[PDB]
């Protein structure tokens with residue numbers, strides 16, 4: 001019993017973190033096999049940030065200009081290339097701690113763990129969700145760039161995020177491991193505003209199922225609804241529309257609790273309309289949306 | 305910017321988790337040097353749980369009755385002893401991944417990370433606090449016993465908790481690494497009720513400082529208070545009394561934000577009396593108490 005915002009064990013990713021320095025800029029890199037991946041903005045100086053031409057800035061850089069340190073030992077850079085917004089630094093040594101891995105590009109609403117690092121050293125691990133506006137609400141200070149987001153399936157780490165920047169509103173933007181930003185963001189010091197941060201409806205429902213499994217049942221109402229009626233209310237409350245695909249993925253939680261997905265939607269609809277009335281669900285006074293249906297099943301079943 | 309419930313990187317602890325089986329009971333063990341630490345209730349059978357006499361149950365156990373598996377390889381048990389509620393199984397092999405470590409007994413209000421494990425394999429990591437009633441609100445399923453709680457200071461892991469059981473209310477109880485339970489709990493299947501789960505006042509204040517540092521300032525009021533006036537309100541709201549020791553440890557946060565500790569107490573007093581009015585602080589609709597002043601400083605400074 002008990003339901004926590006849980007991150008994946010970070011050991012496999014800790015074994016991949018390195019420090020990357022170019023000139024006077026130092027950030028984090030991800031060392032997998034003989035390649036170190038890092039944000040291309042490591043090549044930017046004190047003011048280049050405003051309107052950088054990365055191809056031009058990169059012409060002035062050679063392999064020896066990128067300093068890669070793994071632990072307290074230096075790695076030899078034998079090649080470098082830019083792929084979208086990431087630099088790939090080929091080193092002469094394969095990372096001996098390289099886990100089985102994949103690079104995946106996640107969809108909004110999908111959750112992942114972040115290993116926040118500074119100077120190639122891990123400071124903490126926390127669980128995030130890719131927001132519907134393609135930002136993440138992380139905890140990142142100066143020097144955290146290059147910290148990565150990931151999911152683990154037994155022994156295979158799927159890297160889905162690399163931290164690049166903080167928007168003027170304090171929310172975060174980054175890329176997949178192929179260097180493509182999530183959302184419309186660009187790696188330059190220009191004012192970039194985020195769109196509406198809507199609530200991930202399918203994740204709230206999954207978390208309401210988690211609450212029922214854990215004994216928190218006060219919110220269960222005597223009503224049902226339809227997807228169309230529910231979505232009219234969801235739109236009004238800035239919740240993402242629920243599709244039949246979302247209903248399908250909530251099926252195992254519906255089966256475990258015996259609560260039809262549309263009945264849980266009606267309970268959620270009443271929570272939106274009536275508020276919590278000072279009550280809490282799983283120790284929260286607001287509806288949590290950073291647990292996917294997969295996360296609820298995983299945590300409630302003890303997948304290792 | 306951004307403030308997250310962050311756990312310590314778990315790699316150093318993942319390297320210590322093993323599976324311990326005695327008869328038909330399997331739980332987790334912590335392998336440090338040539339000793340495997342695990343809850344003594346691993347020796348209890350299907351019904352022994354009701355009124356176990358551990359000394360008597362242990363007489364029927366020999367070294368070969370404890371099966372310790374690290375990864376997919378078996379460790380040889382060459383000694384066993386009971387220290388309070390933990391068993392210490394001496395093995396013939398020192399754990400090659402033993403980090404620098406300490407065993408500490410924490411006070412209520414102190415936070416720590418938990419690496420939840422099943423069958424000696426890590427499933428997730430989350431941040432907890434030792435509640436003022438000496439329970440923890442964890443996320444633990446059957447087989448999670450032996451999972452540990454810890455803090456890290458650079459390279460030294462201080463182990464502070466080992467999971468033993470779930471109370472009938474779904475809250476958790478365990479011991480320090482010397483086998484002494486936190487609180488009055490006993491390792492037996494008897495109804496044991498927890499005391500009042502009061503709010504850790506010093507931690508709420510630390511988190512209100514974290515919110516100011518991160519731009520969440522709406523709650524800052526035009527008032528101040530005294531420790532005695534604040535505590536009259538704190539007692540009324542089931543908040544722990546604030547001492548001058550708590551004021552002293554909040555000093556660095558008071559200095560960074562320029563907000564006197566007693567002024568933050570007055571803002572907290574108004575939040576208690578007026579409620580949040582549907583507003584949020586650091587994405588929460590309730591006052592968070594599982595961040596210590598040390599955690600706020602660490603996260604806001606990027607300690608690795």
Ligand SMILES: *CCC(=O)N(c1ccc(C(C)(C)C)cc1)[C@@H](C(=O)NC)c1cccnc1
Pocket residue numbers: 027041044048049050140141142143144145146164165166167187188189305
């Ligand atoms: C890792 C660098 C860093 O801390 N940045 C940062 C600075 C500059 C840039 C470019 C404009 C792309 C050259 C990118 C990232 C911080 C930032 O975004 N400042 C505007 C940063 C601070 C806090 C959290 N993440 C990043």
Ligand SMILES: *CCC(=O)N(c1ccc(C(C)(C)C)cc1)[C@@H](C(=O)NC)c1cccnc1
Pocket residue numbers: 001331345348352353354444445446447448449450468469470471491492493
């Ligand atoms: C790790 C065992 C387990 O899952 N228990 C458990 C069972 C029995 C006992 C004794 C009574 C001391 C012999 C202790 C622990 C669960 C439990 O506490 N059941 C009552 C358990 C379930 C969920 C979370 N933690 C533990």
